[PDB]
Amino acid sequence: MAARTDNSIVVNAPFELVWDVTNDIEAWPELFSEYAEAEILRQDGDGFDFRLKTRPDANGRVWEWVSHRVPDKGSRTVRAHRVETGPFAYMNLHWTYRAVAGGTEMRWVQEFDMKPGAPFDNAHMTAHLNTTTRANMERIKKIIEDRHREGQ
């Protein structure tokens, strides 16, 4: 009926740094391989809306959309959803951060459903997002650990 991704990775760095790096929207084009532009459009206290524009994808297509994001550092969680859904009927995001031995575990969850007629169906988009998410989490893990190394 619906689609979902659930990926985790442990970053060998303190919560504060992991949280500050991953929630720095302006740095997303450097953190995420697929994002060319990331701009915070507006903010209503608790949350904010921001625009994302991708680099050309595996098929030479550039995508662009607006999303609503609500970070809650106190609860070490982030909630977000696409306002402009594109090929998705809907797309929700949920990130959690949990302290573990030696670092911080990040768990990213995506919940969505493809619009009938989309170029990709639930099963295939799920596989695609799992691949890109895992690669991004690994890359971000490295970037954060680089920064952590430089601080000490």
Ligand SMILES: O=C1c2c(O)cc(O)cc2O[C@H](c2ccc(O)c(O)c2)[C@H]1O
């Ligand atoms: O190359 C792509 C791709 C793919 O090759 C296989 C697949 O199964 C799904 C896909 O979907 C990607 C995508 C499109 C619009 C978006 O808003 C988004 O977040 C991701 C796309 O770039």
